[PDB]
Structures are given as structure tokens and as C-alpha cells.
């Protein structure tokens, strides 16, 4: 402790401020012109894609606590680097979310794009949808940040962005799409609406972990943890058969 | 038999579950907000693009039996690996398709995006459209998975995704766009609607094979099958002319 | 004469069939659902992007006579390879355009997306717009096919596609956007509507050439034509100054 | 002075002509069909992405004085090369903007997409939004033009384009989105509407500089300016401790 990391820690702060600012803002109920699911999907997806590009080298652009946690369960980040990230992400989030409230005229800042269950979907259903929404993202982020595969280097930024977008295309009708506890918290804070908030903390965290676990373990990534104690296996591994050869011979004598 | 393949087999299962879940879901008749052709095009196209990215290394992301079959006619996959894929794809498909029925409120899960002929288009026409819809995809997938060309490495995921999207942009008005027997089966199963189902099994399979055949044979890919018996040609190849030289000389004597 | 070229010649045929089929089809006046400028923009742009990807290695994916001509004025293609391309492009075009008429129910195949002046725009204006629409494309195609720059290898397919898209986003309101004499001819043929057809042959050809000329000459590409006769310059180049040195000395004596 | 630079200077002229021509044009109030926020977002974003691709090698495709200035504050361009750029950008801008007025029928060229405060947003708010709109772009442009990172070479053109797009998705509702003093000036000129024009010169310039400063200094880019006088530090750096060792010893004697 500590060096460039502090700045990297910062980078996330700038990222989640920006993403939430643009994101929520682009999803408001503008009376003269009203946001379509796609546009709102594009806006976030592009927002992330843009950030993962900008700050990808500096931070890994988690830009999302669930992603961070996914990165943690998968042992891609420190335990310290995780906490500082989430902290910044939550703070960076409510920062932009406030800047937006200030920047927007009173008539149309209504909801502020808080995450909220729609079409009579149960918090039980809703949370299920959020689970998958994030996992799919986590699966993308990992395949594209995966060092093992640099031959298909492109395209972590754009692919992720559009993954996020894909999340929205479905997850809006159920929830308006959190995928990102930071994202869903900031507006809930400023606006005071915490209805079924937990949904946007469990669905993501759960899908994100599952995601992390499947890529890190269910599929990939072959390597040796070295703590597997492969020195014990090699003692019996040849010797047990030598023993069978050696012990069966001495039974012969 | 058998190793990582089993997992790869799995990967497809996860892929077709996800793609169909997001896909159908994003194409439902949401009363408050209704899906435009583009959005529904983007949603699938992005879904595939995202998957080919995520699971591309693990599976080849066929995510489609017609693609798999295309890959088979083109000798890009095993005969065993094909069957297991299709199996998983069909099962992975109806899996997400069910998860969606459960997750969606009763009022708006109506059709469930089953594939169904629209605008008084004949199953004869419809099937013709599906033919081309898939071929074009198959042509893309191959050009982008083509090993011979790594200099233009990018961009198999995004290009494929958007290819899929391109498929939808037209194939929706005729059929709502199958390109993918798995995709069109899952909803037909759960919903019981099997009207003109065959269309979504023949159009794709046919276009996919054609596609596979043109890239594998009509154009490319120069290599030697070695079973061409090029050892017989080389016996006559020089010697026939030596024979003409040698036999015309001995006619001179 | 002749080898793989014949097939490459073919590749264009398959490309322009496909692009026009999907393209026109996706831009028809569907009564139940009607195409927005974007969707129609995306549909073509994606169509090209997809093709340049699929057949890029085989053909260069001109997919457009104006592009071909641009490639000709820029000396990127043979004079023979050009003609065969254009021929195939025109034939490939009217081929898909027919397939579409056959595949589409009578009620909604109306216009068939023929190119036609809109919003009381003069053929004089219209043609001007088409000029720029294509040049911009030609400028993109060249920068992305430019061998001199392989460090930024990506992304010829996607960038071109979206360039095409960009063309449509503006060129639809003026003309429905030709950029491609093949594209605008096929529907004019089948439908019999040749109103102001020339516009879609001059605007493109003109913008395409201009485009070709600026990249090939106004900017780039440094190389030696060797016919510049740089052997004459090198005789005077040093010797004229030696002569000044040598002749001024002998004037001194 | 001077060589290819003159042409490069030109390249910007061609770029800002094109971008503004397509851009404004695609954002006009077309009566029969009216531009959605996305489409207008796509149109510019694609326009830039296309240009950064086409002319990226020749110019750096600033295509924007604020970007240029950002590039200046960050010492990425000459002081001379900056001025000529801005000059050309402003002139290239009003050039296309005029070409558009001439090309468009009188009924629908109304606003001409001038930048203008909307939804009762204060020039104070408005300018704040513009600040962030550009910074985010500047952050992207730099991360993607950053030489230090060629391993993730892609994708400067597309990522930038879509960054621009992201700018529009939000910045339209507040201002119709300038991000680009050139862009906002051209229409204000031709149309005579200079209402709150300053907003579109301060917001961008301010966000662009901030952006430039954070990437150039707050984060990155490790290098040595050599004017840091690291020769003074190295005199005391070892010697001060040798002095402590040497001076404490002589105090011992």
C-alpha cells in the first residue's frame, strides 16, 4: 500500500458517476419525447461500452458492485480492491444521480428511473429475471477479459456494452433493469423510493456470482492451484503400480 | 471419449437457454410498451453476438441446430459432437422458454413469440424466406470462424450477432424469424402451437446446408483431401508426356 | 485467364442478390408494422457489413457498381474484373429483387422500395445528396481496405456497414437512398418505375469517383509510379548544382 | 513548414463538412417522418465513427474544435496544427451546413438543427450537461488513441462514434447536443439564431479540457518530462543518506 491503485479506485468513481448520470437521464419520462426500450437499452449499453473502453486499462471498468463481487468470487480482484471499488461505485453512483436531479427541470425528473416492478410482476419473478440478466453479462465480461484468449482480442468494450444493452432489452419490462445495485440505489436514495429494493441487490449479486463460478470453475480455466497437493498423487501415482509390480513379484518369491 | 467436450456440450445448453429466454421475452406483446421490429431484431442479434463472444472458445456457439448441421455438412464438427449439440440446443431451448413462461405475468405472455406466418404469406413463401435468412448467417459464421483468415481477425461475435439481427429485420414480417429450429420449437412446445412448424425446420436446415456447401466447396477452401488420389495423376502427369516423347521417338526408329 | 476469379465474380452475384433481397424487403410499406428510417438504415447497413465480412476475402465485396467504379478510378481492380463485377451486380440485384416480389404478398409489395424523390426535392438537389452519400462510403471503404494501415486492422465490415447505414439515415428523406445503381435499378426494372432513374446512376458514380480520387490522390498514398521518370530528375538533380559549381569555376578560369 | 500537414489540415475540412451535413440533415423536422432521439443519436455517432475511420490516419479526426483543444491542453497536437484545425473545422462546418440549406426544400429545413435549450432547462443547467457530454467523449478518444495500449487495439472509430451517440442520447433533451462548437455554430450562422450560443462553446471546451487533463495527468500517463530535473534529486537522493552515514561517523570521531 499503495500506488496507482488509488487512482484506479478513482477511475471507477468517475465511471459510475458518468454511467448513472447519462443512464438514468436518458431513461426519464420526457413529455415532449419519450424513451423507447431500445434507446434506453442503447443508452446504458453504450455508456458501459464507452467506459470499459475509456477506463478499461485503469480499472477493469467493473462499474458495478455485482460485477466486482463476481470478480471477487472468481478471484480476479483483491479483497481490499473490491471493497474500495464498491464503495466508490455506490458513491460515484449517487453522485451523478444527484447531478442529474439538479440538472433536470422539475416537471420531467419524476421517477428518476428508479428500478421498480412493472406489469404486475412479483418481486419473486422480478428477482429471478435480474439473476439471469447479470449472469449473462458476467459471462461476457469474463470471456472478453480472459487473458488465455488474446487471438480474438476484440471486443471487450463493445461486446460488454451491447451485452448490457441486451440485458435492458428484456429486463426493462420486468424491472427497468438494474443489473447493478449501484445503479438502482442512487435513484432510490435521492428519490426516497426503496420499494422492493432488495430485488436489485440479490438478483444481480446472485446472477453475478453464478456467472463468475461457471466461468471460473464449471468451464475453465485450466491451470494449477498448486495447493491441490499434486506431490502426494505423484508418490502413489507411479509407485502404486510399481508396488503392484513389486509386491506381486515378492508374492511370487 | 471423453473430456472437456462434455462441458462444451454444456456450454451450448446454457447458450440456447439464455438466447431463447431473452429473445422470446423481448419479442412479447407488452401492452404498455410494444416491441418494434428493430428492437426485436437487436435483441436476438445482440443475444447471439453476446454468446458467440462468451462461449465462443468453449463451443463455437452454434446455438442453433441448423448452424450445427451447416457445420456438419461442412465437416467442421464431429458426428457425435453434432448430435449432443442439437440435443442440448433443443433442451436448452425449451428450458429457457419455460423459465420465461414462469417469469412472465399471464396477461402478456400470450403468443410467447412462437414463429407464425404473417401478412397472408404462404408456408411456401415463408419457407423460402427462411432459407435465405439462415444461409446468409451461415455464410457469415464461416467467413468469421475461418482459420485461413486471421489477419482480419475481428469480429466474429459482433458480425454474427448483427447478421442474426439482419435476419430478423426482414424475416419477422414473414415469420417472426426462426433461423433456428430450437428457437421456434421451444415456444411451439410450451404453447402447443405447432402450426406450419415444419417451415421452421426446413427453411433453416436448407439455407444452412446450402450456406455450408457454398463456403466449403463453391468458394474455398483450397486444401488437399489427399483422398483425391493425386498419386495416380502424377504417374500419368509427367509420364504421359514422357511417353509421347518416348513413344514418338521409338516410332521414329 | 482464368481461375478463382470466376468464383469471386460469382461471390458478388450472391452478395448483391442477398443485399437487395433483404434490403428492399425490409423497407417495404408493411401495413401492420411500418419501417422507420433507422430500421431501414440498419437493415442495409447491416446487410453490407455482413457481406463485406462474409465475402470480403473472396471479392472485396464491392456489392456496388459505383464502388467498383470508385475502385477502378483508383486502380484497385482490373478493367476486366470491374466489368464482370458490375454485370453480376446488376444481374445479382434484379435476381433478389424478383425473388422478393415472388415471396411477398400482393398487398404490401407496393413500391418495392424503388428509389424515388421525396418531400418535393428536385432531381438536381436529390442527385447532389446522392453524390455525398456515396463519396463518404467510398472514403470509408478505402481507409479500411487500405493495406498501408494494418495496425488498426478492424473494422472494415462493421465500419462500412454502419457507413452505409449513415448514408441511409440522411439519404432516405431525399431519395430513399440509392448509393448503389444496382440497388436502385432492380426495383425500377421489376416495377417499371424509372422516374428520375438517372439520378441514382450519376449521384453515386460521381460521389464514388470523387471519393476514389481524393483518397487515391488528394490524400495518399505515397508510393512511386516509377513512370514519373525520376531518372531524369536525378541527372539534373545533383548535376545541375555540380554544373553551377563546375561552370562557375571555369568562368573563374 | 510544411508538408503533408496541409492535406491533413484539409482532411478535417472534409470531415466537419460531411459530419455536419449528414448530422444536421438527419435531425431536421421532417413532416412526413420525424427523427427519434436514437436515430438522431445514431446518425451523428455513426457519422463520427465513420470519419475517425476514414480520416483517422490522416488527421486524428478531431472533427471538433473542443476535441482539438482537449488535444492541445494534453499536448497531443502542435499549437499551429491546432489553430489550422479549428479554423478548418469552423469553415468546414458552415460549408456543409450551407450545402444542406441549399439541398433541403424550404418547408422542412426550418430550425436546421440549431442547438437550442429545451424543456425549460436553464443555460446554467444546459451548459453543465454539455460539460459532461464532451468530457466523456474526450475520455474515450484518448483511451482509444492511446499509443501505450495497442494490445486492445480496436476500436477507436466505432467506440468513439458510439460515444458521440451516447452523448446525444442524453444531450438532445437538454440542448439537442453540441459537444462540438463547430457543429453548433454552422446552423446558428446560416439561420441567424445565436440564442445562448456561448453555452455550446463553454460546456464543450470545459468538459473537453477537464477530460484531457484527467487522462493526461490525474490518470496517466507515466513517462518522464525530463524537465522534472531528476538530476537534482539523484544528487541528494543517495548522497543525503551517505551524508547521514558519513556525517554521523565524523561526529563519532
Q: How would DSSP label each residue in chain A?
A: --STHHHHHHHHHHHHHHHHHHHHHHTS--SSS---HHHHHHHHHHHHHHHHHHSHHHH----SHHHHHHHHHTT-S-HHHHHHHHHHHHHHHHHHHHHHHHHS-TTT-SS-S-----SS--HHHHHHHHHHHHHHHHHHHHHHH-TT--SS---HHHHHHHHHHHHHHHHHHHTS--S-HHHHHHHHHHH---TTTTHHHHHHHHHHHHHHHIIIIIS------STT-HHHHHHHHHHHHHHHHHHHHHHH-
Q: From residue C167, how far is each of B238, C198, D36, D46 by CA, in Å?
A: 57, 19, 17, 10
Q: Look at residue B116 and give its three-state secondary structure.
A: coil
CB burial of residue D28 (10 Å; 0-12, 13-18, 19+): buried
Nearest to D87 by CA among D56, D66, D65, D107: D65
Pick among B54, B60, B151 to test the A interface (most A CBs inside 10 A): B54
Nearest to A86 by CA among A101, A98, A100, A72: A72
DSSP class of C225:
-
Q: D-chain residues within 8 Å CB-CB of C146?
A: 57
Out of A46, A99, A154, the one facing D162 most closely (by C-beta) is A46
Q: Look at residue D167 and give its three-state secondary structure.
A: helix
Q: A-chain residues within 8 Å CB-CB of B53?
A: 140, 143-144, 159, 163
The 10 Å CB-count burial string (b at 16+, else e) for A104-129 is beeebbebbbbbbbbbebeeebbbbb
Cell digits for B217? Answer: 466447396
Out of B47, B56, B108, the one facing A152 most closely (by C-beta) is B56
Nearest Cα of chain A lies from the Cα of C150 at a distance, in angstroms, of 15
DSSP class of D77:
S
| Residue bearing cell 499549437 | D79
**CATH fit for domain D1-253, picks 1.20.1080.10, 3.40.50.1010, 3.30.70.120, 3.20.20.140:** 1.20.1080.10
Nearest Cα of chain B lies from the Cα of C116 at a distance, in angstroms, of 21
Distance between CA atoms of residues A46 and A164, nearest Å: 8
Q: How many CB pairs under 8 A join A and C?
A: 3
Q: From residue C207, how far is each of B38, C132, C139, C215, D17 by CA, in Å?
A: 30, 6, 10, 12, 15
Report CB contact under 8 Å: C57, B166: no
**Any residues with CB less than 8 A from the CB of D227 and at least 6 apart, and which?**
none
Measured from the Cβ of residue C53, the count of other Cβ atoms closer than 10 Å reads 30
Nearest to C179 by CA among C206, C158, C148: C206
Nearest to B38 by CA among A38, C100, A26, D36: A38
CA C231 to chain centre: 37
DSSP class of C153:
-
CA C25 to chain centre: 21
Chains adjacent to C (≥3 CB pairs closer than 8 angstroms):
A, B, D
User: DSSP 3-state helix, strand, coil percentages of chain C (rounded to 5)?
Assistant: 70, 0, 30
**Any residues with CB less than 8 A from the CB of C29 and at least 6 apart, and which?**
C35, C108, C110, C111
Residues 62-91 of chain A with CB under 8 A from chain D are none
Q: How many CA atoms lie within 13 A of C69 on its CB side?
A: 23
Whether the Cβ atoms of residue C156 and residue C144 lie closer than 8 Å to each other: yes
Mind spelling out the 3-state secondary structure of B74-87? Answer: CCCCCHHHHHHHHH
Nearest Cα of chain D lies from the Cα of A175 at a distance, in angstroms, of 21
Whether the Cβ atoms of residue B21 and residue B100 lie closer than 8 Å to each other: yes
Give resolution, Å, one decimal.
Answer: 3.0
Nearest Cα of chain D lies from the Cα of A248 at a distance, in angstroms, of 58
Whether the Cβ atoms of residue D215 and residue D147 lie closer than 8 Å to each other: no
Nearest to A195 by CA among A93, A123, A97: A123
Closest chain D CA to residue B153: D154
Q: What is the DSSP string of D18-34?
A: HHHHHHHHHTS--SSS-
CA angle A109/D163/D79 to nearest 5° reads: 115
Whether the Cβ atoms of residue D83 and residue C206 lie closer than 8 Å to each other: no
Report CB contact under 8 Å: A219, B7: yes
Q: Is C120 on the interface with D (CB under 8 A)?
A: yes
Q: Is A58 on the interface with D (CB under 8 A)?
A: yes
Q: Which helix (H) or strand (E) holds C120?
A: none
Nearest to C157 by CA among A155, B144, B145: B144
Q: Is A159 on the interface with B (CB under 8 A)?
A: yes
Whether the Cβ atoms of residue B70 and residue B210 lie closer than 8 Å to each other: no
Measured from the Cβ of residue D121, the count of other Cβ atoms closer than 10 Å reads 19
Q: B-chain residues within 8 Å CB-CB of A166?
A: 22, 43, 46-47, 50
Nearest Cα of chain C lies from the Cα of B33 at a distance, in angstroms, of 15
**Any residues with CB less than 8 A from the CB of A246 and at least 6 apart, and which?**
none
Pick among C54, C147, C153, C163 to test the B interface (most B CBs inside 10 A): C54
Chains adjacent to D (≥3 CB pairs closer than 8 angstroms):
A, B, C
Q: Is A34 on the interface with B (CB under 8 A)?
A: no
Q: How many CB pairs under 8 A join B and C?
A: 118
Out of D7, D56, D161, the one facing C218 most closely (by C-beta) is D7
Measured from the Cβ of residue B101, the count of other Cβ atoms closer than 10 Å reads 17
Nearest to C48 by CA among C162, C163, C180, C161: C161
For helices B5-26 and A156-174, give the axis angle rounded to 10 degrees.
50
CA angle C31/C36/C39 to nearest 5° reads: 115
Whether the Cβ atoms of residue B75 and residue B184 lie closer than 8 Å to each other: no
CA dihedral sign, ordered A104, A109, A113, A115: positive
Report CB contact under 8 Å: D136, A46: no
Cell digits for B239? Answer: 509420364
Cell digits for D227? Answer: 524537465
**Any residues with CB less than 8 A from the CB of B176 and at least 6 apart, and which?**
B27, B113, B114, B115, B116, B118
Q: A-chain residues within 8 Å CB-CB of C154?
A: 154-155
Q: Is C31 on the interface with A (CB under 8 A)?
A: no
Whether the Cβ atoms of residue D19 and residue D96 lie closer than 8 Å to each other: yes
Closest chain D CA to residue B158: D158
Nearest Cα of chain B lies from the Cα of A250 at a distance, in angstroms, of 37
Report CB contact under 8 Å: B32, A119: yes
Nearest Cα of chain B lies from the Cα of C95 at a distance, in angstroms, of 13
Report CB contact under 8 Å: A120, B103: no
Left, alpha or beta for C82 (phi > 0: left; psi -120 to 50: alpha)? Answer: alpha
Nearest Cα of chain A lies from the Cα of B178 at a distance, in angstroms, of 19
Distance between CA atoms of residues A184 and A90, nearest Å: 10
Q: B-chain residues within 8 Å CB-CB of D155?
A: 154
Q: What is the dihedral of CA B230, B235, B240, B243, to 10 degrees?
A: 170
DSSP class of B216:
I
Distance between CA atoms of residues A136 and A133, nearest Å: 6
Backbone phi and psi for residue D111, each to the nearest 5 degrees, phi listed first: -45, -45
Measured from the Cβ of residue D112, the count of other Cβ atoms closer than 10 Å reads 21
Q: Which helix (H) or strand (E) holds B198?
A: none
CA B123 to chain centre: 21
The residues spanned by each domain of chain D are 1-253
Nearest Cα of chain C lies from the Cα of A154 at a distance, in angstroms, of 9
Whether the Cβ atoms of residue C174 and residue C121 lie closer than 8 Å to each other: yes
Nearest to D50 by CA among B250, C163, C234, B137: C163
Distance between CA atoms of residues C183 and C44, nearest Å: 11
Q: Is B34 on the interface with A (CB under 8 A)?
A: no
Q: From residue D196, how far is each of D24, D81, D180, D201 by CA, in Å?
A: 18, 29, 15, 10
Whether the Cβ atoms of residue D156 and residue D52 lie closer than 8 Å to each other: yes
Distance between CA atoms of residues C179 and C141, nearest Å: 13
Distance between CA atoms of residues D14 and B60, nearest Å: 43
Nearest to C59 by CA among C7, C98, C24: C7
Nearest Cα of chain B lies from the Cα of A230 at a distance, in angstroms, of 20
Q: Is D161 on the interface with C (CB under 8 A)?
A: yes
Q: Is B128 on the interface with A (CB under 8 A)?
A: no
Out of C7, C33, C46, the one facing B173 most closely (by C-beta) is C33
Greatest CA separation for chain C = 99
Q: A-chain residues within 8 Å CB-CB of C38?
A: none
Amino acid at each position: 500500500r499503495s500506488i496507482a491503485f488509488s487512482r484506479a479506485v478513482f477511475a471507477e468513481f468517475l465511471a459510475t458517476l458518468l454511467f448513472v448520470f447519462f443512464g438514468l437521464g436518458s431513461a426519464l419520462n420526457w413529455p415532449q419525447a419519450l424513451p423507447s426500450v431500445l434507446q434506453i437499452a442503447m443508452a446504458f449499453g453504450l455508456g458501459i461500452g464507452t467506459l470499459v473502453q475509456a477506463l478499461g486499462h485503469i480499472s477493469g471498468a467493473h462499474i458495478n458492485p455485482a460485477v466486482t463481487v463476481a470478480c471477487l468470487v472468481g478471484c480476479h480482484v483483491s479483497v481490499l480492491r473490491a471493497a474500495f471499488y464498491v464503495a466508490a461505485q455506490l458513491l460515484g453512483a449517487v453522485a451523478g444521480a444527484a447531478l442529474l436531479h439538479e440538472i433536470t427541470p422539475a416537471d420531467i425528473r419524476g421517477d428518476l428511473a428508479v428500478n421498480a416492478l412493472s406489469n404486475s410482476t412479483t418481486a419473486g419473478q422480478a428477482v429471478t429475471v435480474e439473476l439471469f440478466l447479470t449472469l449473462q453479462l458476467v459471462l461476457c465480461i469474463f470471456a472478453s477479459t480472459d487473458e488465455r484468449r488474446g487471438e480474438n482480442p476484440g471486443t471487450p468494450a463493445l461486446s460488454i456494452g451491447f451485452s448490457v444493452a441486451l440485458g435492458h432489452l428484456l429486463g426493462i419490462h420486468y424491472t427497468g433493469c438494474s443489473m447493478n445495485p449501484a445503479r438502482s440505489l442512487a435513484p432510490a436514495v435521492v428519490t426516497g423510493k426503496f420499494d422492493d429494493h432488495w430485488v436489485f441487490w440479490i438478483g444481480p449479486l446472485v446472477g453475478a456470482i453464478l456467472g463468475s463460478l461457471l466461468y471460473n470453475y464449471v468451464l475453465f480455466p485450466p491451470a494449477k492451484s498448486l495447493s491441490e497437493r499434486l506431490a502426494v498423487l505423484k508418490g502413489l501415482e507411479p509407485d502404486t503400480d510399481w508396488e503392484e509390480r513389486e509386491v506381486r513379484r515378492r508374492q511370487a518369491v
